[PDB]
C-alpha cells in the first residue's frame, strides 16, 4: 500500500489480519490463534543508479488477554543500499540465506516451512545481525542467476559468573540453542524460462562455547546445505527441497541434532476462480541424537498436509489447513522432549493490505 | 484518516493521544495516565455485493518508564466479510455482544462502563476467539432493527502437570476468572425513529473445569443478560441499561460473584460551542459472594460521575471527569480484595486521528 | 512523511531503521544493536490562532530473538495546543526542559548525550507526566527569546506495606532512582543571528520518601542546572554545554550522585559532498559518592569520541562512531558499581522517513 511518494522517497505500509482458529487435541495448539502483522517498507532514490531502503515487519498476537505479556515481536528490521546492476547490501534482522531455498516450499495455507527452519537459528531462517550481499546477474557473468553472500556475527549469551562472555543481544537466560557464533552463507537461484527453477544455499558458522558444552550435539561448527527445484507454470506450483544440517537444528525442549536429513514437497494448482488446493509433505530425520549416553535416530518432524486457500482478491482470503502428524504418539521420545504428535485443523480468514 | 484507496482496497489509520492525569488518594490509580491508541481499518471491494475488512486496535501505555514491561497490548483484531444485506461475519479479538447494550451507557468523558463489563470476561467486553454474525436491517425488511449472533470458543489455561487442561492462548498463570469455555451470545436492537432506542443482549457460556474448582463461584455455565434504552437526539443523550450476570464477572483480587445486579445511567447534553456535560451513575450490586465459607451480598461497583468534555474540533478535545465513589471505605471487605474505595478526578487533553 | 492532509488534519509518520553493530570488548555492548523507531506527528487547525497536536515515538529493538521480552517502548507521547504566536502547551511523555540545552551537544553519530542525561530521571531527559508551557517571545518581552515553564507530577513507586504510598505508574519492583516527586522547570534560548546561540536551563524537584531513605544521595530535593553555547553556521557545528545536578543523577547498578559536574563538547564539519566527521569529549565528575559508607569523587562518565556520518540524502545515511573511554580501568569502583570502562566502535546504516 503506497502511502507516501514525495521528494524521491516512497513509503508503503503492509500487513495482515488473520482470524485463525486451530482445532487440535494438543491442548498447547488448540484454540484461538488470531494474530496480525504490521510493518512498513520504504525506499529512497539517492540518484538514478542508487537507492536506499529499510524494512520493518512486526508480529502482534491477538489471541491472549490484554494483561498477557510478550505478544509482540519483530520479525524483520534491516536497512540496505542497491547499486543498480552491481548488487545490494543489507544489514539487520533479515532472512538467512538458507531461506532462499526454503521459501519455495514454505508456501502452504497455514503450516509448513518447519522441517528444519527455525527463527533465530543460525541462518536457517530470520536471524539477528546478518550482513547480506545479493546480486541478480552473478557479477554480470550470467543473466538471471541470483547470488548471495551473507555473514552473521556472534549472538552469544552472557554468564552471570564471568562478565567477559557473550554479546549484548542475548540475555543470560537465553536458550543456548538459538545462539550462534560468526558465520557466512552462500546461496544462488535460477529461473530456466520454462517455469522450472532451481536454487541452493550453503552456510557455515562457529558454535558458541556454551553450545559445545551444554547441548547434546557435540562439535564446534554448525553447517547446512540445501537445494530445491520448483515448477511454477500453467496454474501449477510444484516445489520440493532437500537439506542437511550438522550440530545446528534444535528439537524438543532442550535438544540439538548432530545431523539431520530433511525433505519437503508441496504440490499446488491455481483455479481461475480463486481456489488453490495444496498437497504437501515435510520430513526431518534426526540422526545421532545423544539421549542418555547413547545415540539414536528419530524423526523430529514428519507430517503430511492437505488444505486449500480461497482468494476473493489480492486483499482478502480464507483457508483451511489439515496437518496430519505422522510421528508416533506411542513413542515416548516425543512426549519426553515435548515434541507434539497430535493433528491440527486450521481455519483462517485473512485481510491483507 | 484515509491513507490508501487504489485498486479496490481502502486503508485508514486511526488512533488518539490522551494526555491524562488522575488526582486521587487511591495510590494505585493516582497520577499520570497518559496512553495512546494506534491501529487501522481496512476494507476491500471484492465485488458489488461482497466486502472484506480487517481491523487492529493497539493500546500503548506511555505513563511508565522506557524499562517497564507489558505497556502495550492489542484491544481488537479481526477479519471479516460483509455480504450486502445478508449481514456480516467476523472472527478474532472483537467485542462481545453484551457490549451491544453497555456501549450505550459507556459514553463518559473518562470513567464509566464498569458496572459488570470486564475485558476478557467471556463476552462482557472484548474477547478472544469470538465469531460474530450481525445483520443490520433484518435483511433489508425492517429498518432500524439490528440483530447479532455470536459464538466464543473455549479459552482455558493449562494445568502445571496435566496435559489435558487449557488452550494455546491462555497460560496457567492467567487469572482463571478471565478464562472461559464455549458459549454463544445473542443481541438485538431497534430504533423506533424518535431518537429513542431499545436493545437487549444475552450470553451463555460453559465455565472451565478450573473455573468451577479454583474460584468462589459454583455452577456449570456462566450466563448474563442485559437490556437498555437510549435517547439520542437534539443534543441530548440519555442512556441507561440494566444487566444481570451469573457466575462470570470478577471482583477484587481473586473473586468471581455468583450473581450481580447492575445498572448504569448517563445524562448528557451537547452544547453548540463544544461543551458536553455528563451526568452519570453506575452501580453493580454483588450477591452471594463466597468470602470465607459464607455467603454475602455487597456492592462491587457503585459511583456517581460528573464531567465535561470540550471538543475543539473532530481532531482535538479536552475533558475533566469526577468519579464520586459511594462504596463504604470503613467496610473492611473492600481493601481485603483490593477493590477501590476512593474518588477520582481526571483531566485529559486528547489528540485524535 | 506526510500521508494525510484532509479537512485541516495532518498525519505524518516518521521513524528510522538502523542497521547497527557495536564492536566492543565489553560483552554487555558487543554485537548487533539493530533497532527502529516508529511514530506519528499529527496536527489539526482548530481555528486561525489555534492548533492541536499529538505525537508518539516508539522504539523497537530488533536485535534480540522473537522470544525476547521488552524489545519495545515509548519514548514520546504528548498532546498539546499551540495558540498561534502566544506559545504552546503540551502534556504527556515528553522531554525535560534540561534537554533544551543538552540537545545541542547530543548530536554525535551514534554516541553522546550521556554525560548526565538519562531517561525517566526527573526532567533530565524523557519523563512521564510533564506539563510544559512554551513561548517563542518570552511573554512578548523579547522577540526571538524562547521560554519554557514545565511541571512534572509525582512519579513515586507503590509500597507493598503502606498502600497509600506511591503512584499508579510505578510497578512492583520499580527502581526508585528513576522515580521522582513534584518539580518545576524553566528554560530559555536565543539565536544571536551570527550563528551563535546560547541556552540555559534549571530544574528543581522534590524526591520521594523512599528516595531519601533507600538511596546513597542525601537530601530532600533533586536539582539541576545547565547552560550551553553553539556555533551553527559556515558548515561548522560547535556545541558545548556545562551542567550541574544535585541528588538526582544516577550511576551504576545502585547509585545516586549527591552532586555532578558535567561538561560536553562536539566539534563538527560538514563537507559539501556529504561527509560529516565529528570529534567530541564528554565528562561527568561524580562527587560525594556514598559508595561504601565513605564519600568519594569519581569520574562517572568520561570519554572522547571520533566518528563520521555520511549522508546519501535526506532519507539515508551511514556512519561510524568510535568511542574512546577514559574511565579508570584499574578501579574497583567501576566493577563494584557496575559501570563499564571499555571502548565501543559502531557501524550503522540508517534509513529515515
Residue numbers in the entry:
A (entry chain C), B (entry chain B), C (entry chain A): 1 to 353
Quote the passages of the study that discuss this structure, keeping the authors' original sentences.
The porins OmpK35 and OmpK36 belong to the Porin_1 (PF00267) group of bacterial outer membrane proteins.
Like the other porins, OmpK37 assembles into a trimer, with each monomeric unit composed of 16 β-strands that cross the outer membrane to form a β-barrel. This impediment is dominated by the inward folding of extracellular loop 3 into the β-barrel lumen, to form a “constriction zone”. However, the crystal structure of OmpK37 dismisses this conjecture as the tyrosine side chain is oriented toward the pore exit such that it does not contribute to the constriction zone. All other residues of the constriction zone in OmpK37 (Arg37, Arg75, Arg126, Lys16, Asp106, and Glu110) are conserved and adopt the same conformation as in OmpK35 and OmpK36. PhoE porins have a constriction zone radius comparable to OmpK36, while OmpK37 is in between the OmpK35 and OmpK36 pores. Our results show a lower permeability to some antibiotics (ertapenem, cefotaxime, and ceftazidime), but the structure of OmpK37 reported here demonstrates that the pore diameters do not differ and could not determine drug specificity.
